[PDB]
Amino acid sequence: SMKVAVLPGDGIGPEVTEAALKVLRALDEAEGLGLAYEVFPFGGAAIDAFGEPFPEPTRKGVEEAEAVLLGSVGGPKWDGLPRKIRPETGLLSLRKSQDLFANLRPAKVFPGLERLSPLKEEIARGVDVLIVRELTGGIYFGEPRGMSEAEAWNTERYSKPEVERVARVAFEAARKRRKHVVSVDKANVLEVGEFWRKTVEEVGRGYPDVALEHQYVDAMAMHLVRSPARFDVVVTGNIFGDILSDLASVLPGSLGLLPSASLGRGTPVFEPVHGSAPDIAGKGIANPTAAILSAAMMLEHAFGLVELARKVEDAVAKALLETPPPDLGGSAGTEAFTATVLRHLAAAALE
Amino acid sequence: SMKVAVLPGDGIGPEVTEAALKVLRALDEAEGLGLAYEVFPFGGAAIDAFGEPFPEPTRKGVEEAEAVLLGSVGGPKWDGLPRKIRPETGLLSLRKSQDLFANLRPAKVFPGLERLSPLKEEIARGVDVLIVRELTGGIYFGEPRGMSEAEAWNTERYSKPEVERVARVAFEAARKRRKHVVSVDKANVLEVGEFWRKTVEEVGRGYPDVALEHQYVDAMAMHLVRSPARFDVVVTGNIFGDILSDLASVLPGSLGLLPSASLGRGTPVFEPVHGSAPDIAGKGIANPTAAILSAAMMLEHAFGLVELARKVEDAVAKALLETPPPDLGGSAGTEAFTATVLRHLAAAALE
Secondary structure: OOOEEEEEOOOOOOHHHHHHHHHHHHOOOOOOOOOEEEEEOHHHHHHHHHHOOOOOOHHHHHHHHHHEEEEOOOOHHHHHOOOOHHHHHHHHHHHHOOOOEEEEEEEEEOOOOOHHHOOOOOHHHHOEEEEEEOOOOOOOOOOOOEEEEOOEEEEEEHHHHHHHHHHHHHHHHHOOOOOOEEEOOOOOHHHHHHHHHHHHHHHHHOOOOOEEEEEEHHHHHHHHHHHHHHHEEEEEOOOHHHHHHHHHHHHOOOOHHHHEEEEEEOEEEEEEEEOHHHHHHHOOOOOOHHHHHHHHHHHHOOOHHHHHHHOOOOOHHHHHHHHHOOHOOOOOHHOOOOOOOOHHHHHHOOO | OOOEEEEEEOOOHHHHHHHHHHHHEEEEEEHHHEEEEEOOOOOOOHHHHHHHOOHHHHHHHHHHOOOEEEOOOOOOHOOOHHHHOOOOHHHHHHHOOOEEEEEEEEEEEEOOOHHOOOOOOHHOOOEEEEEEEEOOOOOOOOOOOOEEEOOOEEEEEEOOOOOOOOEHHHHHHHHHOOOOHHHHOOOOHHHHHHHHHHHHHHHEEEEEEEEEEEEEEEHHHHHHHHHHHHEEEEEEEEHHHHHHHHHHOOOOOOOHHHHEEEOOOOOOOOEEEEOHHHHHHOOOOOOOOHHHHHHHHHHHHHHHHHHHHHHHHHHHHHHHHOOHHHOOOOOHHHHHHHHHHHHHHHHHHOO
16 A cells, blocks of 8 residues: 555646656565555645645545645746645645644755766765654744834744654664764754753654754854765754754755655655646656655655665756756656666666 | 053953053054053952952043953852952943943954954855844843743833833944944844834934844844844844844854943943953963054044054954964964064055
């Protein structure tokens, strides 16, 4: 069993999600994975068809599946809509409906793509860092909150269970990688930082196979530029994670290379970081790497098929060098690039 | 009049502060600045001499002067002391005594030093950014604050006068540079961010000669790595400023190049970012660039002698290429490097 709800969304979403499906079907056929999937309406296309971005049929399909493969969502066309039915509200409704409390965003400098990084080649080399960001609490949602003409106030607050559950997702993710977690806080100045640190240390005792270190968020802004290749997994609160994930996201030097996973109680959601790029919808040029790597994330984080996720990543790594898409200075269309990924998957299998 | 209280502090502090004084005496002699200075005990040396880091005589001298030239402070020797008399408490007492509410930290990639940056040469080229960080408020000092076994909480809060006064320091600093301020907030999610943005926009109307743009803190973590050369002045709240100033601080690739200024109601304090480096105290090798640039900051931000500050910066820029200190891969001692700075100041004057 591998039951996937596919929500291809808007703009280039249908193209790049289909590229990811071609990869998953090739794996299913080669490995006997028991893949079953169904496509559901979501985002702008759903608004246009049904009058809302996350209609009942889709909520049901997402609930019933074991993972969501989501394309890009939204665009200029729907920007003038009431908030209640906007594509972005659909995305919040999707994530809330599943209580997804951890966002995982990996930033990887593939070998031979150091040239793309803003960092010098020797610093970019070997970067492969996974930022795990607490998604449902902290100052973004804390109470009290408000403003008057005199002042305004927001509250960074965390309860023990919120810190525990994001930490566990980080330790589990590190087991699948290089078994190293850095937890990030502001424990030398803030009570929430002290509390976060002690809670993560306590949770860490359940994961004796994973090394744990603590760093302050300001020091981490230094380290992600000076020696990012030193990290494996990094876990932190919502606002710090938003900042550091954005910092890590620019190290590979290309938006089309970045996948995202959101994990929690319900069905986990895997999607590209890039948007719907409507100006190139239907052209067959979008770089499907983010989507394909989101399917590798699905294999790894929803299904525990870590060896398979690594095979997909290696095939993508080779394809980026062999037949780079236009965003990397090459000329490979979406389908040609997907075919190159499949050739490498096939070649690695035939050992 | 230019009355300066010199607090040379600990470790390499006396050496590098004297290098800065040689520069200021050369300028005073060439320009007729009316420099008057006195040396006062501060930090570990004061603890050893008087039993406390910020004794009465020094508080008086700081109050009576127009600026403080402060060396590095602290070290291993005093780490086991009660908080009440630690060197770090001395520094907090110094800054509080003067109600210094804005910290200004410039990060500059001097021409021909792009090689030092972690960023590719073409991105490092031309970086000259000044981060202005609100120093006395925001979540670091906000109430309510606390922790229990169940949860912990800290409050990011700002009143209108706190935002106004740090913004004015940023607009004033931009006038002396390239007349461009980017204010940074989290206005798309947080009430404090909305409040900060509207307040800064209102203050900006008093500075029609300075351009103003707003950016979110997460976007700024992207921009300071992908296109830092695009910024001139950046102003933000305490925790965001701590994070972004640390991020900017690594772009030049050398700690010895970074000065700091703290400005507010009382006497403004100019100091290196580097610490006391006690292992090389008395060797005559410390790079005095941070201290000398802190004296340029003093000229600019305390005395408005912007042309003179730029002359000191240009002479330092040439000296770093001609006679680089050991931290830049060269072999110039502290005095030889200071002499090179003086040769360039002399040569630029004799037009």
